[PDB]
Amino acid sequence: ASMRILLSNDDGVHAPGIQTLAKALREFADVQVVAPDRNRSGASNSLTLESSLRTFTFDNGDIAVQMGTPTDCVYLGVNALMRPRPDIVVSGINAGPNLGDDVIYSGTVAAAMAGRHLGFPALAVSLNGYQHYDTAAAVTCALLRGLSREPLRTGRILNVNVPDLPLAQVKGIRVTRCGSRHPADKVIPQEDPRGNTLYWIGPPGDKYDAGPDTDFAAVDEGYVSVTPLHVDLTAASAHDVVSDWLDSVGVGTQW
Amino acid sequence: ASMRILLSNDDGVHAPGIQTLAKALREFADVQVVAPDRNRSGASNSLTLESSLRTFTFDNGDIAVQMGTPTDCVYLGVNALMRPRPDIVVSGINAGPNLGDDVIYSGTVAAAMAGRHLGFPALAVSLNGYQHYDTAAAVTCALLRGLSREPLRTGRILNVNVPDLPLAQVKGIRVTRCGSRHPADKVIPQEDPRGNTLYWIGPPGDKYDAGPDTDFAAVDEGYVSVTPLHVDLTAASAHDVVSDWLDSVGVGTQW
Numbered sequence A, B: 001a002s003m004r005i006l007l008s009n010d011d012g013v014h015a016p017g018i019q020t021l022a023k024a025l026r027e028f029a030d031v032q033v034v035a036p037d038r039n040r041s042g043a044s045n046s047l048t049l050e051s052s053l054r055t056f057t058f059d060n061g062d063i064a065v066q067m068g069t070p071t072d073c074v075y076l077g078v079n080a081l082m083r084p085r086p087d088i089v090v091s092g093i094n095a096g097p098n099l100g101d102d103v104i105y106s107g108t109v110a111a112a113m114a115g116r117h118l119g120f121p122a123l124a125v126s127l128n129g130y131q132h133y134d135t136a137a138a139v140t141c142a143l144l145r146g147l148s149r150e151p152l153r154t155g156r157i158l159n160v161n162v163p164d165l166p167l168a169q170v171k172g173i174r175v176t177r178c179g180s181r182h183p184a185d186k187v188i189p190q191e192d193p194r195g196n197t198l199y200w201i202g203p204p205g206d207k208y209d210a211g212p213d214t215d216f217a218a219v220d221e222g223y224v225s226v227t228p229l230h231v232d233l234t235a236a237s238a239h240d241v242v243s244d245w246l247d248s249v250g251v252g253t254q255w
C-alpha cells in the first residue's frame, strides 16, 4: 500500500525541479520517472502519432523518451513501461508558473491530464520561479499524504501552483479557478545572417481576469493555488445562444 | 466589408482539405493561408518558444511555417504576417473527425483556438473521412455567410464536424457538447532492425459518453455537429468537493 508514482514533467529526466521532487517522493513512495529525455515547455498536449518512440534509460533508472512529449511519456509510462501500473501521475516541479489560460499550452499540465483516469487524481506542480523547489516538494508531499488519508471524490486532475517562497512564508492553500489574459499580440523579429526575417513568439498578454478566486490572485498573495481541471472544452454557457443564432441566420434549417 | 480569412489547418499548406476549402472561400472572401509547411496531427496546442520560426512562401502565395505548429501558424498569421489583420480564423478542412475528448489533442482545433480573440468566432472544420470535402466546404461557407448576416454574441470558437456524406444526405445541424471516451490503453510495440523495442501510441478508447446531444451522436446520425469551445480548463463542479477534501485531510490548514 506504498504509492506507485509515475513522475514526469515538461523539462526532462535531469531539470532540477523533477530531480528535487524525485528525491522527496522516494522517501515514502516508489517512483519511476517516465519523462522526456531532454525542454518541451512548448509541447502542450502534443503527442507522437506518425512515429514510434524510443526510450533510453540512464544509470539511475530515469525511464526517458527520445523526442518524447510529456503526454507521450505518461502514455507510455502508464500503458507499457510501468509494471505494476502507477497509482498516480505527478508532473513537476516545473520551473515557472502554469496559470490562467496558459494551462492549455502547458506540457506539465498535459502530463497530468494524461494520468487522469488512474485511481488517484493526477497532480501538476509548478513553482512560480526557480528558487524554492523544496517548498513545492513539501506541498506536493502534503497533498499526496492527503490522498492516501482520504480519497478525492470529484476532480481528476489538480493543477498546483506554488509561490516561490520559503515554506514558512506560504500563507496557505486556495481552491481556485483559472484566470485569463488579454490576447498575446507581440512577435519579435530577428534577422538571420543572410538577412531573412525570423519570428519569435512574444510574451503572454497582460492579465485580464485575476480576481481573488483566481489562480493568479492566490499565487500573487503567497498561497498555494489548487485548480481542479478537466479536459472537456465544451463552452456549455454558449449552447442556447449558438442554437438561436443558427435558427436566426437560417443555417441548418430551410425556414 | 469582404471577409479577410486566415486559413490554417493541421495538415499544411498543400492537404487536399485545406486546398479544397481555400478554393471555396476565395469565391467570396480574401483568404491567406497562414499554415504549416508540411502532417502535424500530433500537435495539439503546441507552439514554438525556444526557437524563432522561418516561413517560406509558395508560388501561389501559400504563407507557410517551417516546422510550424498550427498554433504557431495562426499566431504569426494574426500578429505579423497578415495585413490588415484577419477578421476570422478558419482551420480545416481536416481529413478526419475532431470529436469528444480528442479535441484537446487536435491541431485543427488549436489553430482555431488561437484565433479566438478576433472579431468573429473562429471555426475549426473537420470531415468525418476523406471523401466529401465539398460537403464540408459548403457547410463552412454557410456558417461564414451566417456570421456576416448576424454576429454571434456568445461563443468564441465553433468546433464543426461534418459527416462524410454528399450534401444532400446531411440531415441538418445540431449544437452539441463534446462526448468522451474510455481511457486509451494500447501500445503497439515494434522492434527496430537491431532488435530494440519501439512503441507506437495505440488507437483511442471506446466511446463512453456518446448520448444524443453529443458531437459523436450528431455526426453518427448524419448531422453537422457544432460545439462551442473555450480554453478554460477549470472543472467548476469540483470546487466545493476539493475544498472540503483539503479541510478534511488537513492540507493547507493547521486544524
Ligand SMILES: [Mg+2]
Binding pocket: A010, A011, A040, A041, A094, A095, A096, A108
Ligand atoms: Mg516547463
Ligand SMILES: [Mg+2]
Binding pocket: B010, B011, B040, B041, B094, B095, B096, B108
Ligand atoms: Mg489532421
